[PDB]
Amino acid sequence: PQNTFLENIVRRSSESSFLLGNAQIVDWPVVYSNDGFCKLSGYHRADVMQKSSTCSFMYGELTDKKTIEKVRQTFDNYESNCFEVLLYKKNRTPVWFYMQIAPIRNEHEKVVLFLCTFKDITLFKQPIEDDSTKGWTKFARLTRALTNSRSVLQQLTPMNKTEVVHKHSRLAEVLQLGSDILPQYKQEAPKTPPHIILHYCAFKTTWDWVILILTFYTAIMVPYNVSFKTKQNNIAWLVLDSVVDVIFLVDIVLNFHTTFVGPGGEVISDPKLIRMNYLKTWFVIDLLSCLFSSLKVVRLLRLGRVARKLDHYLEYGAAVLVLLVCVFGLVAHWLACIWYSIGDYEVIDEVTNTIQIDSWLYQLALSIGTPYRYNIWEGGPSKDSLYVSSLYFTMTSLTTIGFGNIAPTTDVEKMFSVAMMMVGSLLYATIFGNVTTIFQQMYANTNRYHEMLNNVRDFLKLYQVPKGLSERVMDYIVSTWSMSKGIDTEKVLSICPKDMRADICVHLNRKVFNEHPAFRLASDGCLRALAVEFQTIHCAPGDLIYHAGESVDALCFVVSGSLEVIQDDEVVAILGKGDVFGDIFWKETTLAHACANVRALTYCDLHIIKREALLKVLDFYTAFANSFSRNLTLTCNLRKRIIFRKISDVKKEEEERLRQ
């Protein structure tokens, strides 16, 4: 979804000087000056910007009020028009320009920008100049300014006293340019010429899958027909063949209206390029469909046609596992057809009309009951058994089993099997390479976890760690792997750019920025800066976050669970579900001593922001800092010591005063 607006203008402009300017703002500031205008006015792209789009910076002592007021009028109410004006220049050279102001609309018509293409007009207007010594200077300037117009612009029929081919020639062209140069400032989708099919839409996927199914059908049924010679059932076989041929011819026709991915870019919806690519690349697939052994053998290239697109159907995983079986079952059938052809060529030696006793069909006939009889030689084994018995041998020879009850024994079957045993070995090797790689990839996820467990267990057993810490660590590892199985936030957020990483971080800490008063009057540009520093810890029962002597250097927000603040072995605070605890960092500038042990009572979730990062963010946006200071009150400040007196001490003091 591109917002291509600066490309539609230039490619239909042919070296213009368009001067897009903002329309909603008063005085219509210029927003983009084309390089063409950088030479037609002598101004660089440093002072045309932020000035009025009405071209009020090119005025002087010669501009007339016949159109300037009209220019302001046509800018007031949004309407295209074709005024003409006399303007000065950076070098103080008065020349005439042909204004072509025209509005440009948004997704919903709002007139956002004002296209203001200029055009030099000096030959076609009466020269006027004041600071000139001789009258030939302006006449020379006529040709000097309009050099491009002397060749192709307005020289179709060059002569004198023909100004009428200059005023009305493009007077009303602005409406004729409504489709040429007046695009829509919209988030456009990939646009295509009429009757062009995109390769990404949800229509070509169904055709791709249908072509895959039909290619498998043809690969299965063509060698069988050209090897096991069968007649035509007409109503159930001829119809299917004709329908498949028509479907593939329609596919060839529709292949002229696809969109190929560019070699160094994205979709190229140019019909000429598509046709050139199809001419250069793939009439091999056109030959096969259009109009015997040879015809079907060349029809078999349709499988190569469907294998060309082996990128949308296939992924690296279970898809390869399915493909490696679907191709094995096809090789075992092609070889089963070739083997039957070889074993049927040599049975009846037609030179002398005798049966060869060292073939494989005759010995199969001897071990199945049905013999061969002489009438010509009559039939032997049935046609429904000559295929099972011929796929059996191929399947034994490809899986390296080799029962050897059907074996090559004449002279040529031994020549064919030598070739079979090479392609079978190669296929077997490729299959057992691919399956090993696929299984390694699949199970590589649960190998790191077990390796980590083994390393931790060996570490805890080698150094004789006590049972308590050993079991605690062993439980912690399992707990962390039970909710973050393989996924690590650091690496995933490392491969993302600076923009969306902030959005992901803001989303992750959505339960501290929403349900907490402090993060209420906060700019988005500051939330995206705080959310990067917010970490997260997953406490467990009995775990201590701050001990009795550690330095409090992190503000913690509890989002799920409960904590216990114990001081002098006395409970003094029970935090839970939306209570902040820590130290006031912005107003103290000194690290403190945690005067109380914070111990978890339930599986807790805390979001921690370090002292340094919080101070750095609060030292930059010194507008949110005041709201943060005045809106965040800590439920348990771990710097102030709470002094109290247990009842036991009071009772002891009373007893002591009772004694004396």
Q: Among 252, 298, 300, 477, indicate the residue that binds a second copy (CB under 8 A).
A: 477
Count the Cβ atoms, other than its own, within 10 Å of residue 108. Answer: 6
User: For residue 606, is it left (φ>0), alpha (ψ between -120 and 50) or beta?
Assistant: beta
Number of residues counted as binding a second copy (CB under 8 A): 150
Partner touching 236 among K ion, a second copy, none, CB below 5 to 8 Å by kind = none
Question: Pick from 11, 15, 24, 160: which binds a second copy (CB under 8 A)?
Answer: 24
Q: How far apart (Å, rounded) are the C-alpha atoms in residues 250 and 205?
A: 15
Q: Rule CB under 8 A: which of 107-126 touch a second copy?
A: 112-113
**429 lies in the site for a second copy, by CB under 8 A:** yes
Both tokens assigned to 219: 């690969």
Q: Is 425 in the site for a second copy (CB under 8 A)?
A: yes
Cβ 397 to K ion, closest distance in Å? 10
**Which stretch, 82-90, 123-131, 240-248, 543-551, contacts a second copy (CB under 8 A)?**
543-551
Q: Is residue 339 within 8 Å of residue 398, measured between CB atoms?
A: no
Q: Which does 200 bind (CB under 5 to 8 A by kind): a second copy, K ion, none?
A: none
> Which one of 157-165, 201-209, 212-220, 504-512 is the stretch in contact with a second copy (CB under 8 A)?
504-512
Q: Which of 151, 375, 648, 660 binds a second copy (CB under 8 A)?
A: 648
401 binds a second copy (CB under 8 A): yes
Q: Which is nearer to K ion, 312 or 414 (CB)?
A: 414
**From 161, 194, 497, 657, residue interacting with a second copy (rule: CB under 8 A):** 497
Question: How far, in Å, CA of 410 to CA of 420, rounded?
Answer: 16
Tell whether 280 is in a known binding site: no
Q: Which is nearer to K ion, 402 or 525 (CB)?
A: 402
Residue from 273, 650, 653, 654 that binds a second copy (CB under 8 A)? 650
CA–CA distance, 282 with 255 (Å, rounded to integer): 10
Q: How far is Cα 75 from Cα 73, in angstroms, rounded to an integer?
A: 5
| Longest CA–CA separation in the chain, Å | 142
Q: What 8-state DSSP symbol labels residue 386?
A: T
List Cα–Cα distances, 610 to 116, 123, 638, in angstroms: 54, 73, 15
Residue 188: DSSP 8-state:
B
The alpha-helical segments, DSSP class H, found in 255-354 are 271-281, 284-289, 293-299, 302-308, 318-345
Angle in degrees, CA 51, 53, 57, rounded to 5: 55
Task: Please select the residue that binds a second copy; options are 131, 499, 655, 656, rule is CB under 8 A.
Answer: 499
For residues 94 and 42, give the distance between their C-alpha atoms in angstroms, rounded to a whole number.
12
Nearer to a second copy by Cβ, of 30 and 306: the residue is 30
> Given the DSSP bridges, would you call strands 636-637 and 580-582 parallel, antiparallel or unpaired?
parallel
Q: Can residue 403 be called a binding residue for a second copy (CB under 8 A)?
A: yes
Q: Which range of residues in 62-70, 220-228, 287-295, 497-505 is near a second copy by CB under 8 A?
A: 497-505
- Rounded to whole angstroms, the Cα distance separating 211 from 208 reads 5
Is residue 623 annotated as involved in ligand binding? yes
Q: Which is nearer to a second copy, 207 or 328 (CB)?
A: 328
Q: Which of 165, 300, 301, 456 binds a second copy (CB under 8 A)?
A: 456
**Residue numbers belonging to the annotated binding site for a nucleoside 3',5'-cyclic phosphate:** 518-635
